[PDB]
Amino acid sequence: EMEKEFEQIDKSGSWAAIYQDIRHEASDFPCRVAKLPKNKNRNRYRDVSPFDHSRIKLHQEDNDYINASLIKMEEAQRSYILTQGPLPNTCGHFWEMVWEQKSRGVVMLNRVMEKGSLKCAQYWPQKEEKEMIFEDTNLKLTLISEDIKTYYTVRQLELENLTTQETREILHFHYTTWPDFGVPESPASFLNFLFKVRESGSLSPEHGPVVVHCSAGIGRSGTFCLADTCLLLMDKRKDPSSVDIKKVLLDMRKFRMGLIQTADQLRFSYLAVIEGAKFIMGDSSVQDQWKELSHED
Ligand SMILES: O=C(O)C(=O)Nc1sc2c(c1C(=O)O)CCNC2
């Protein structure tokens, strides 16, 4: 059981060793496209790059590079795209990828400003009447509506391909109280937000992969995706003891580096999956309890 393991870990105080053990074993694949000179201004952090094998390519002939990867979880049957916070020159490339990849949802786990720095571009419109036009990739993006809770906001955005005039509805789920290099305030408020995303349909396999990002696309995003996948794996089998969280994380780290950036975020994932297991295993009433606990209103 993950729960007995949690207890050993905690008792022996060795979250840091455990986490280091994962970092040591994580895969190392080339990121030669990321490191081409021409892409330097497409990467927010010099030490966070997409592997070549899993990177998302833009369907453009000029330069197909974006800092983004496809995390394809075979067994679980779920994929995600993990990407950094768009830069002021790659917001057009971001929405290009959303369009071409056919995603329905975008999960934003950071604020634009954190720890006194600009962690991400303001890449979506904040009022209905001031849409965004991304001229390099020839897309218009409009705020259609927004559901502001205390700790997250859900926006419906309309993405127009200005060439064909085709239009798509994207949902944006903005978690605003999860600190960089930090954890959510409680398992309940994170699980409540995760289940908002699920219930919206955006993780349905009839859509392209959901796009998940934080500032670097690895720490907060890794934590979110690990919890989601572990819960889905246990759902498929109705067998919580078959799920091995660290092994799930190593498999995700085959497709992007650095997933989960600190030992406490690893700790947090166990908490989130252990609590989430209650819902998976047939008490849906816990979902209402999460909602109340997270004071969403
Ligand atoms: O946004 C996150 O959750 C995350 O992984 N952020 C990261 S991972 C990372 C950095 C940051 C950052 O935001 O400064 C700075 C460069 N080193 C690795």
225 lines ligand 1 (CB under 6 A): no
Beta-carbon-side half-sphere exposure of residue 245 (alpha carbons within 13 Å): 29
Residue nearest to atom 6 of ligand 1 (CA): 216
Burial-class residue 253 by CB neighbours within 10 Å (0-12, 13-18, 19+). Answer: buried
CA distances from 112 to 9, 135, 210, 266 (A): 34, 22, 20, 24
**Topology of 1-297 in CATH?**
Protein-Tyrosine Phosphatase; Chain A (3.90.190)
For ligand 1, mutation pick of 49, 181, 266 (most atoms within 8 Å of CB): 181
Hey, what are 1's tokens? 């059981």
Hey, what are 32's tokens? 């030669």
From which experimental method does this structure derive?
X-ray
Cα 141 to Cα 131: distance, rounded to the nearest angstrom: 6
Cα 283 to Cα 78: distance, rounded to the nearest angstrom: 23
The structure was resolved to a resolution in Å of 1.8
In the annotation, is 214 catalytic?
A: yes
Hey, what are 54's tokens? 């899993």
Residue nearest to atom 10 of ligand 1 (CA): 216
Q: How does DSSP classify residue 182?
A: S
**Which is the closest atom of ligand 1 to the Cα of 110?**
1
Hey, what are 2's tokens? 């993950």
Hey, what are 68's tokens? 């983004």
47 lines ligand 1 (CB under 6 A): yes
Residues after which the chain is broken (C–N above 2.5 A) are 148
Ligand 1 center–CA 46 separation, angstroms: 11
